[PDB]
Structure 1
Amino acid sequence: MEGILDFSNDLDIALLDQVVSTFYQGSGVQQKQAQEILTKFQDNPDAWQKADQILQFSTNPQSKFIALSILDKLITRKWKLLPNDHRIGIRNFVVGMIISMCQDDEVFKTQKNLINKSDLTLVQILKQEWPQNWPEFIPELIGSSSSSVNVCENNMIVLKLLSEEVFDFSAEQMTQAKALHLKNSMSKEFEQIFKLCFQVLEQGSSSSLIVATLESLLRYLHWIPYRYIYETNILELLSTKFMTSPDTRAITLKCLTEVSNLKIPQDNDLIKRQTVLFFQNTLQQIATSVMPVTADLKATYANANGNDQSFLQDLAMFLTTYLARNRALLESDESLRELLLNAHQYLIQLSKIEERELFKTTLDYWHNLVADLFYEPLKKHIYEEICSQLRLVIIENMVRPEEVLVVENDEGEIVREFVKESDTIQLYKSEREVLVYLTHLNVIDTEEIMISKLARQIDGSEWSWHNINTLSWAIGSISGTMSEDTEKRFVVTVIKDLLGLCEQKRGKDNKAVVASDIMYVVGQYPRFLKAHWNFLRTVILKLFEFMHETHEGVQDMACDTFIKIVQKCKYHFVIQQPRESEPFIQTIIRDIQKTTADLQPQQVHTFYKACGIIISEERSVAERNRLLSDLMQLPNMAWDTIVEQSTANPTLLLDSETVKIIANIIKTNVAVCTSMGADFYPQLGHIYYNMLQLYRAVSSMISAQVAAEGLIATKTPKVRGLRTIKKEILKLVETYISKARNLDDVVKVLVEPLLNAVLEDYMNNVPDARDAEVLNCMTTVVEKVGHMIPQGVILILQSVFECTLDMINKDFTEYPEHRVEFYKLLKVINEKSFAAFLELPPAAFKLFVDAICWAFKHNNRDVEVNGLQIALDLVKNIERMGNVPFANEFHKNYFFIFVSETFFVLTDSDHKSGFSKQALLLMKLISLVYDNKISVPLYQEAEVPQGTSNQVYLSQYLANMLSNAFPHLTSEQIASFLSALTKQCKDLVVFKGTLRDFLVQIKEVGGDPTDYLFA
């Protein structure tokens, strides 16, 4: 099998044809070795010399396909490099073998893959040679089309692929100058291409030639002038004749869709009429040749015969595309009314299909419509009946909202969701928007539908979990659209009815469904709840009952419902209501232990967070602080008992139950702090010093355990628990500082005990014991108070900078959090307190510049962006220093390091996603020398002549760099590129373009240096 690699001997074709057969038609270990042999055969630079041998003599179509792949690579990369007799010779056996295969009816039928590849491989030659070295291609292609039907059909495939390669996929793969050259060449000779295309459409009716001709037509519609479509009969042919045969229908519907999407010269009544007419015809053919408007398109798509699903997909795409753009043409004229409503009745029927991605396509249209009907005068009455059906369609297909935490499992029981359904969140939002708009357009109709559905749920004649769920989610979704008085009675009826179902329906399962729907509804209607206190009180007490429920979904949803209600209704908890001896927040806090007794720790923390939201509504500082104190009674008593014990020891923390008690105390403090923000200061102050003492104590035990048991200790439960305590203490401080209003007390009271506790600890621990959350905590400290503590920023750098950089500079994989949080911290320092980097000794500042270019080289999106942003901001920072010693020594040491490293990531293919920021950075660097913002010389005193400008040396450096980095470029290619690149350094869109031209030319040999004179 490996004898085909050796080209010192002649290539054995019969051997090649078996290693290919082994690869495609074989399996196992024989297949794997055969693929390696084929990839090495392909990747050999002299393999193209064997391609004509293969195309003539080979018996296997896949061998021939791979022969053309080798040519494809030769033509796109090393074409220019070849002798002209090889280029003209390669053209001959490709053109000669395409026509060979089209004369043989059996080869034309059975080997379509090989023919399509030969056609694509020809188009690659045309890109290189046409029309400058092949002016007669298009007139000779038209001349050949008259002789044979196979040749005519295949020419439509060549013209299709040529249109793709020039107009659809040229932006990335060609220079701007060559894409424009090819577009103009086709644009110049399209007159006679269309003449052929159109006469073929009139003379075939339905066949493979007609399909191929319509396939190429689809591509032409992406770019050709509007006159070709509208000043020819072709719209009649598409909208009538080609709709009737199913062979042409799919591709015609796609053509018409592309046509439909165009914007019309609205001054012209003739094009308007022609735009009405092709729609009128298309709809007529669908009604007569496919299915009527009444047809059950849901059952059809679900049965999935032939191309029925693709067809209905394409119809939806055609109807929505046309009607979004052109429905106003059908809306005034009374004779066009039936056409408008039929087209919308097809969408109503398409919208009933069970297929989410199709439903989204239709829903996007309905949104476009109902949005327009909301704002456009005199439109909604036209679609009253369409809208009335759409309310019913949407109510019946509401997806489970995020808040509803119960589902039916595959067994058939009502169970807590295992995970969040991330993909249905956008779908729900989309449904709510449309359903909200429809409710606004006729509030009476929507109420009647929902109430009559809800009546049939009660009597049992339409009861199920799907029906009651979708109803309730829709009822919830439309909160906001009714009046206060209408909502009042509407909500009362819905609740009172859902409570009726509660009573009648028995079992663990039924009760959980109805409760989850009651919860969803109640939480969606805060305005009702605010105006009706007795009810609000009852709700909240019922939610507290559900916190003791043995069903976990119900329990977990009651907590989320509670928090959700209080975010909106908090004010009604802080005041003293009529008929109440006190604010309800007092009552809640009082029974907090009893209420949250059956909850898991994270749910208890939500409950405390909710109490926090309420408490922050109290504006009297004396009373807010008192409420804060009462709320934190349980965790403070737990905390005070822990410090008395930790004073005696501190080895009692080893007990993992103590670790858990501690962690949950901090987590509760974090949770109340997230809702209270700046108002949390009094509770933080109560525990702060004992907490940072516990941080040290906990940090001792971590280090002690690492020494005692090894690095494996960091994976154990007890250490991970101890590490949690540290992470949560840092989270609490990060959270407080991030929301604090009084920044003076942050700097004076909090910052200096914090830094002492965490920095030296971070620095002196082994890599695997260092919490990345230290870095994150410091990012926030510098962000909010960095300007206020410049000496404290220096202390942060000294502790975390070099030891963290050493963790992350071996490879790109290890310590991923530290990596990410490290560059965030450096970013905010460079913005807010740049002075800290000036105090770094020279060798450490070198490590800082090395750290930034290391960030560039990351594939990791988070690191890469921050890397490029620091580089940008560092240059601005050094620029604004002006002409001083540190700026001069910066530019002499690090300017060309940034230029060359920015150039490496542009040009190496593996950092494509940072192209915009790389281009901007490089522009800013080049700008400096063309504005003379670098005052000193960038060169050694005797490297170039005396007093040579930095502009001259910069071009000379880059010429040399690129010449060595890309030795296949010519001196002229480089010289041209840089000339262009430099004088476009105040024009980013063109600068970027000139870079992309460079990126194209480096993938090939012999690129045209005039290409860079494009703007």
Structure 2
Amino acid sequence: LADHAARQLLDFSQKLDINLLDNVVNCLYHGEGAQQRMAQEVLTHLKEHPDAWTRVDTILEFSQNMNTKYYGLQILENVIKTRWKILPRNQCEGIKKYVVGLIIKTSSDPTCVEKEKVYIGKLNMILVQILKQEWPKHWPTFISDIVGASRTSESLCQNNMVILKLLSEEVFDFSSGQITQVKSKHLKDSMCNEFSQIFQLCQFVMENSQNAPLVHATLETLLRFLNWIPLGYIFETKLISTLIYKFLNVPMFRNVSLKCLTEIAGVSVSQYEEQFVTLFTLTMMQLKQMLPLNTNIRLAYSNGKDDEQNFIQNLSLFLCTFLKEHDQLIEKRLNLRETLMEALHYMLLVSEVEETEIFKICLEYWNHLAAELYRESPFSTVPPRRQLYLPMLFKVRLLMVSRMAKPEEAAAVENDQGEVVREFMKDTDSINLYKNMRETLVYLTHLDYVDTERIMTEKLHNQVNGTEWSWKNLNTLCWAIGSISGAMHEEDEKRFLVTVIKDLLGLCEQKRGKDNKAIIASNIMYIVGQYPRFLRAHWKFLKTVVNKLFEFMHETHDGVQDMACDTFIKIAQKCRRHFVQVQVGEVMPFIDEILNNINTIICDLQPQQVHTFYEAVGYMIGAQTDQTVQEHLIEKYMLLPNQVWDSIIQQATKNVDILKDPETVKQLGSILKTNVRACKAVGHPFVIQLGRIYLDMLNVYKCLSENISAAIQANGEMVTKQPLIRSMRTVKRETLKLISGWVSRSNDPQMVAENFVPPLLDAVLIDYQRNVPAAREPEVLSTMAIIVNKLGGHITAEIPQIFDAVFECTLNMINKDFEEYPEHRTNFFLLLQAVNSHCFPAFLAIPPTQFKLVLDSIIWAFKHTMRNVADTGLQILFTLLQNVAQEEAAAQSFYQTYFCDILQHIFSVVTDTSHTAGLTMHASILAYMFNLVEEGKISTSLNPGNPVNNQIFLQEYVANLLKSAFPHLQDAQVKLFVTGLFSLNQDIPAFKEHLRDFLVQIKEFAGEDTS
């Protein structure tokens, strides 16, 4: 259990202590903790050593526990994967025979089904590796040998079925990225070429054998074969009939069988029409035996065991697959109406299963059917296919209305600081589920508005009587009601909403107590927000709704206020017009009333809700087009926050120490959040407010920054977790947010550059440089990035001084490993990308040593394992190569200085197993660069060798570079790869596959020819 004992395991001067190897492996699996790491290091270290497999046999001969035998098998797999083409031929034959003999011996023992199945599987995988390495050429009779030996014994045949399945998986499913392209084509052609023999064996076992495990393994293999085999074996043999009759109905075989059928149903081919019909017919005739249509499949799944559940899901998959691909074939056969309906009935039953995955499988088909019927004809209460499906479309509509998922998703998420904000998750599986249910229901509502309205009226009647009254059920009904918004004509929509609102009002009046009234009040709020056309059509209705929301903003009950604010912002965005223009029966536009009453409306809201409110009002203000009226609206709009802001600025002028008061900093952060939301809504004209506070804001930023910095130097890193430092960092972040957010939406780069940028240089940038490393706010860099991206040229001239502040001192934070200060790395290369992409003359205008530093930083970027960092680094390098190619004068000097350097760095990354994610970029660059050398490059990279053209110098230089990088390569290999670099420099995916082939080659030794 000691490091020395572990080190003994790898001496190579003495016999292996299989006793000790077992102890170390048992430490690997059951070793508790601190030596576990040791034991793993030692086992990996031995496994990767060059001697490797010399002991493999010893391990297998003498060891007592399974894990150690498995470890030896790992070593054997390593040798076969990498150094097989360099073993002497007799060694390969000995390993071949050792392996198939071990496979034989293991299966014969009864215990194999028992005990270590894992070990048998690993052995079969070893043999499949040997096959992948040399199956056609060096083992030409293999398929014949094992097909014949399978008719001798049945256990041998079952294990050989597993072997054939693994070979199919390795040749046809996972060949790309593990096997070179030509060898993949070769293995596929070789398996496809000798397949009829294998299929004979399978037909024989299926039709004749009564060994249940062997039959199961054969079916499992037939699955993977269905993935790739020619259609003749599937649709021109006994196969479909044999599956449906002999295996689909018997319990232990029903899953696999059905899976196979599903795969066969996935094939989309015009020539096997009848067969497909058969496949449906027969399959249905079996399902009605095993699963009578009267069955509560919801209960059957809810109570049932694992294979029952798997069969229900496989049934959903089969019916969805077949119907989507071949519903037309059964539609045009009258003698099959009843059967088709039955299948649909099945789906409906399966749709009641409370399992969101199975339900998504069903909703896939329901959306398909609704979309097909809508594309046939989009009009209401006759086309033929819809006439076929009419007896059950109402069942489908009831399903959608009755199981509607929640429309949007909110969650309380805590930021980098302590603040828990209410974040609406934007793009999730559940929201996509809602959108699919909505699409289906909207299709079917277009097919018949009356039927949808009737189902909803019945659900809501059941709400009113108390039969189906629950917070959950009312929520679901209202979600559906909102989901069909826009599906009906505006007149039908109005009549329908009038009834809905009236009945919901009556239901409210009926129930008593805050909890019931709260649930009903939101549902009403949600429904109203979901119908903006109705609101724009009726003015008083809308005014009264808005008046109530303002009322609800004082309800202390939880969620009433939140829903009030959410509905307010939805209505404000969707009806902004109606607040700025004077309405019929009104003396002044509503915005002026709201602005006169802000302080009355928001006194009881929590800060986040106030932010939401101000954003909602900002949309209205942005709707007003006359610049002067809009200015006055903005001034009254920001009255209340500006009051507290000016109070705090004045107190700070009198005494700065109030900027260390907790509640003062909390208020400053809240005010800045309010400004940020207002700016998002209002847009460019918000400048009038921004410029009003700008300088003041920058001032407080500076001060707070310094505070945090000093607070670090006094107490180190710990101090960054205290509430006060936390709220100060919040102020800094909201300041940067407001600045970059207004700049993002500013339509005057001239004014921005001359007015708003210069104060940043000393207030934030040199302040960033002056901060202690841990105090530097990464969000500085990113904000600058945004500014650059928006300013373009109007900011080129200022690139130097900015870089004086942020560049040098940021590099030294992120050039001593690849991991610390991640936010800074990301934002830094974002800023550098912005500069290179929009202000390239600045790179041309700096000293060459500094440009060398910039280029080095780019290279440093794409060496990252942080994918986004390396990705933006490659993008920078690519657009930089093009930008250099833009001007002929410095292009040749840049090439002479950096071309080979860039090439060797990129090659260091391309051959790295940790950067494959960037392949598409790598190719795109290399291709480009190599194309550049074919023509378009005039000067010579090497002053000493001018005879040689760049292609000749590049060819031999890169070949030398790879030969010295990977010494175990062949000269022919390297020459072929280097010439392929030039040959494929205008087919980027072919170039990519060339790189992937080479990346496979650099992982295994090769001897003499490819053979």
Normalising to structure 2: TM-score of the pair? 0.93
1:506 matched to 2:512? The reply is yes
* Letter in structure 2 aligned against 1:897: D
1:934 matched to 2:937? The reply is yes
Alignment of 1:848-863 (within 5 A): 848-863=854-869
1:570 is matched with which residue? 576
CA displacement at 1:171 relative to structure 2 = 0.8
Q: Specify whether residues 564 and 403 from structure 1 end up closer, same or farther in structure 2 by C-alpha distance, changes over 3 A only.
A: farther
Distance 1:693 1:28 in 2: 53
Alignment of 1:644-663 (within 5 A): 644-663=650-669
Distance 1:969 1:102 in 2: 40
Deviates more, 1:919-928 or 1:26-35: 26-35
2:594 is matched with which residue? 588
* Letter in structure 1 aligned against 2:329: L
2:200 is matched with which residue? 195
1:72 is matched with which residue? 77
2:567 is matched with which residue? 561
Alignment match of 1:242 (pick from 244, 247, 250): 247
2:955 is matched with which residue? 955
Deviates more, 1:341-350 or 1:867-876: 341-350
CA displacement at 1:125 relative to structure 2 = 0.8
Q: Specify whether residues 603 and 281 from structure 1 end up closer, same or farther in structure 2 by C-alpha distance, changes over 3 A only.
A: same
Q: Specify whether residues 890 and 333 from structure 1 end up closer, same or farther in structure 2 by C-alpha distance, changes over 3 A only.
A: same
* Letter in structure 2 aligned against 1:987: D
Q: Specify whether residues 769 and 64 from structure 1 end up closer, same or farther in structure 2 by C-alpha distance, changes over 3 A only.
A: closer
* Letter in structure 2 aligned against 1:928: L
Alignment of 1:389-788 (within 5 A): 389-402=395-408, 423-703=429-709, 705=711, 714-788=720-794
Conserved? CA contact 1:458–1:501, under 8 Å: yes
2:367 is matched with which residue? 367
CA displacement at 1:507 relative to structure 2 = 3.4
Residues 589-632 of structure 1, C-alpha deviation per residue, up to 9 Å, x if partnerless?
A: 11101100011222212211111111111122222111111111
1:301 is matched with which residue? 301
Distance 1:806 1:706 in 2: 19
* Letter in structure 1 aligned against 2:876: I
Q: CA RMSD in A?
A: 2.5
2:917 is matched with which residue? 913
1:284 matched to 2:285? The reply is yes
Conserved? CA contact 2:409–2:431, under 8 Å: no
Q: Specify whether residues 458 and 1009 from structure 1 end up closer, same or farther in structure 2 by C-alpha distance, changes over 3 A only.
A: farther
Deviates more, 1:234-243 or 1:38-47: 38-47
1:867 is matched with which residue? 873
2:416 is matched with which residue? none
2:418 is matched with which residue? none
Conserved? CA contact 2:324–2:365, under 8 Å: yes
1:315 is matched with which residue? 315
Q: Specify whether residues 835 and 128 from structure 1 end up closer, same or farther in structure 2 by C-alpha distance, changes over 3 A only.
A: same
Conserved? CA contact 2:463–2:474, under 8 Å: yes
* Letter in structure 1 aligned against 2:407: P
Distance 2:823 2:59 in 1: 54
Distance 1:79 1:230 in 2: 40
CA displacement at 1:33 relative to structure 2 = 6.5
Distance 1:33 1:727 in 2: 45
CA displacement at 1:563 relative to structure 2 = 0.3
Q: Which runs of 5+ in 2 are unaligned?
A: 378-383, 413-420
1:85 matched to 2:90? The reply is yes
1:352 is matched with which residue? 352
Q: Specify whether residues 712 and 839 from structure 1 end up closer, same or farther in structure 2 by C-alpha distance, changes over 3 A only.
A: farther
* Letter in structure 2 aligned against 1:226: L
Q: Specify whether residues 816 and 115 from structure 1 end up closer, same or farther in structure 2 by C-alpha distance, changes over 3 A only.
A: closer
1:124 matched to 2:125? The reply is no
Conserved? CA contact 1:498–1:514, under 8 Å: yes
Identity of paired residues, percent? 48
Residues 129-178 of structure 1, C-alpha deviation per residue, up to 9 Å, x if partnerless?
A: 21101111111222212211112222211111111111011112100011
Distance 2:35 2:884 in 1: 61
2:828 is matched with which residue? 822
* Letter in structure 1 aligned against 2:93: I
Distance 2:800 2:864 in 1: 27
- Count of residue correspondences: 991
Distance 2:230 2:714 in 1: 79
Conserved? CA contact 2:181–2:997, under 8 Å: yes
Distance 1:107 1:488 in 2: 72
Q: Specify whether residues 659 and 951 from structure 1 end up closer, same or farther in structure 2 by C-alpha distance, changes over 3 A only.
A: same
* Letter in structure 2 aligned against 1:501: L
Conserved? CA contact 1:205–1:241, under 8 Å: no
Deviates more, 1:631-640 or 1:535-544: 631-640
Conserved? CA contact 1:404–1:520, under 8 Å: no
Conserved? CA contact 2:778–2:827, under 8 Å: yes
CA displacement at 1:17 relative to structure 2 = 5.4
1:995 is matched with which residue? 995
SS of the residue corresponding to residue 759 of structure 2 reads: helix
Alignment match of 1:219 (pick from 218, 224, 240): 224
Residues 760-800 of structure 1, C-alpha deviation per residue, up to 9 Å, x if partnerless?
A: 22222222232222222221221122212321233322322
Alignment of 1:102-113 (within 5 A): 102-107=107-112, 111-113=116-118
1:272 is matched with which residue? 273
SS of the residue corresponding to residue 135 of structure 1 reads: coil
Distance 2:625 2:591 in 1: 14
Alignment of 1:126-145 (within 5 A): 126-145=131-150
Conserved? CA contact 1:403–1:560, under 8 Å: no
Q: Specify whether residues 700 and 78 from structure 1 end up closer, same or farther in structure 2 by C-alpha distance, changes over 3 A only.
A: closer
2:335 is matched with which residue? 335
Conserved? CA contact 1:239–1:281, under 8 Å: yes
Distance 1:666 1:27 in 2: 52
CA displacement at 1:263 relative to structure 2 = 1.3
Distance 2:875 2:36 in 1: 48
Conserved? CA contact 2:911–2:999, under 8 Å: yes
CA displacement at 1:281 relative to structure 2 = 0.8
Distance 1:34 1:1010 in 2: 38
* Letter in structure 2 aligned against 1:9: Q
Deviates more, 1:28-37 or 1:296-305: 28-37
Distance 2:702 2:35 in 1: 62
Q: Specify whether residues 1009 and 576 from structure 1 end up closer, same or farther in structure 2 by C-alpha distance, changes over 3 A only.
A: farther
1:898 matched to 2:902? The reply is yes
Distance 1:527 1:41 in 2: 72
Conserved? CA contact 1:206–1:247, under 8 Å: no
1:156 is matched with which residue? 161
Conserved? CA contact 2:753–2:794, under 8 Å: yes
Normalising to structure 1: TM-score of the pair? 0.93
Alignment match of 1:98 (pick from 98, 103, 111): 103
2:893 is matched with which residue? 889
CA displacement at 1:849 relative to structure 2 = 1.0
CA displacement at 1:196 relative to structure 2 = 2.0
Distance 1:75 1:871 in 2: 40
Residues 518-540 of structure 1, C-alpha deviation per residue, up to 9 Å, x if partnerless?
A: 12111111111111221111111
SS of the residue corresponding to residue 132 of structure 1 reads: helix
Conserved? CA contact 1:973–1:1007, under 8 Å: no
* Letter in structure 2 aligned against 1:252: S
Deviates more, 1:532-541 or 1:867-876: 532-541
Residues 680-724 of structure 1, C-alpha deviation per residue, up to 9 Å, x if partnerless?
A: 122223333433344444445455555666665554444443343
Conserved? CA contact 1:166–1:183, under 8 Å: yes
2:381 is matched with which residue? none
Distance 2:612 2:330 in 1: 55
Deviates more, 1:13-22 or 1:764-773: 13-22
Conserved? CA contact 2:712–2:774, under 8 Å: no
Distance 2:748 2:500 in 1: 47
